[PDB]
Amino acid sequence: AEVLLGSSDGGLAFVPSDLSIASGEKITFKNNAGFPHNDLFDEDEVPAGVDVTKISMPEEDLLNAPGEEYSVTLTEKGTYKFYCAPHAGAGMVGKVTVN
Ligand SMILES: [Cu+2]
Numbered sequence: 001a002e003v004l005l006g007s008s009d010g011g012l013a014f015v016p017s018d019l020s021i022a023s024g025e026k027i028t029f030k031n032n033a034g035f036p037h038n039d040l041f042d043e044d045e046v047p048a049g050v051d052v053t054k055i056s057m058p059e060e061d062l063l064n065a066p067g068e069e070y071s072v073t074l075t076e077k078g079t080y081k082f083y084c085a086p087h088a089g090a091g092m093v094g095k096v097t098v099n
Contacts, residue, residue: 045081
């Protein structure tokens with residue numbers, strides 16, 4: 001699955017912000033517009049047994065340019081919430097469900 005970081009007209013969102021994949025699918029977050037962005041999983045909203053540090057970009061790493069991306073494969077079933085640090089207050093938050 002592919003997720004865009006920022007919308008064509010600079011809007012501060014994940015596109016799409018709600019996705020469902022199957023266990024073992026790869027999500028590739030691609031830097032699109034409205035830089036900079038990053039991807040952090042919410043420690044409170046992840047399936048028990050998921051290690052957040054293993055699955056997240058460090059909160060301070062940022063993608064500042066086109067072509068930059070972040071890939072992660074999720075295996076545990078259930079719902080994970082994620083956000084973009086710089087834009088958390090702007091509502092750039094999303095959610096994946098692994099089936
Ligand atoms: Cu962002």
